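Z., the sequence and structure:
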Amino acid sequence: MKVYLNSMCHMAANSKTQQIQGDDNKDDKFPLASISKVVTTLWAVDRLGPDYRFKTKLHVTPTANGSYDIHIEGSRDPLFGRNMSYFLISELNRMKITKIEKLTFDENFLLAWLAEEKPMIGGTTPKYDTVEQQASIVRATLTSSFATAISPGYYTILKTKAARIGVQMSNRPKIDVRTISFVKKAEFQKNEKSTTMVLMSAPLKTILKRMNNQSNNYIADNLYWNLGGTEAFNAYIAGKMQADTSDIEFHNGSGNNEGSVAKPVYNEATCEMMIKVLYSLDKSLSAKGYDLSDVMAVAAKDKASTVGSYGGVMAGSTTAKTGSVNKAKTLMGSVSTKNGEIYFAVLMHTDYDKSRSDWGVASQQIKNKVSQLINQNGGPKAIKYTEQLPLPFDKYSYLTKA
């Protein structure tokens, strides 16, 4: 690979002028890769708030034969796949539901079994043209995965993690489901003897922490669509930053290639816009009592993240999001130094076709530049942070009768 710097820039968090320091390319657009996910994080924090929960509702009606019909009124929870399903099945059994006759769901019930795994973390997030096409696929996933025997290995890994955050799950959960179909919200009205039960996701801050630890494309793309997509994003950023297409041009929430191999399309912005995003996201989280480390990964301390391997002066001092696509490798976040907290962004150009004997070049240049920033500012100052365990649910997610 051959590499060169597109731009690097930075700003003290307490600057009274909010002038951004950096090279002469700091106001030129460059591909962002997954540092796009911090922009989606800021939009989601501003629109929904860090303590927002996706409230998926189950409408449960007893049946004549002693079982239940259940209709899922979806919430567009963007992290509802295998692990939330396992928790839901545990919770159904805790609520004495073991057999379902008719399971139906609406167009806001988004289910992607592998949402937190390969290949959805790094894949092209499915984009459906109609709700019927989406639901065809959700029905198939409910039939093949939700309704069939639970994997003992994945389930016991989840249950042990859930216990660490104070959530109870049963040892041998099991559900039987007779029939599964799509019912649009406009075609659903509850039965007279139905009980509504609410399954809340973990708070948005936790969903964002998991996304920004893993670099999860599925979660990022579905948050961006849920908030209105590109037309809504462009208006949000024009109203928030007085920015326009010359500052920032997005097409999806993840930063992944949104086009074809021969016509690729990547989110782009200027380095200065990345600093203004971080300043605004830090300000919105502080108003709710949170820090960037509540939604972004901490070097070394978040071992289940793309910066768990980072060491040196960044370990424990630096909160940051990585990105990589064919032509760009990027990093942005904050460094905590003896002279205070400093926002930064580093945007590198990569060419993988050349000098194939050379690898890890852009990553190591970025680490060296960020380390230098910390050291010019008196060295690292450890932040206050305990490694989080961000699962799709928490101890307030239990099914609860409304």
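Residues 27 and 143 are 51 Å apart (CA to CA). The first strand starts at residue 2 and ends at 12.

Let me know what you think.
H.
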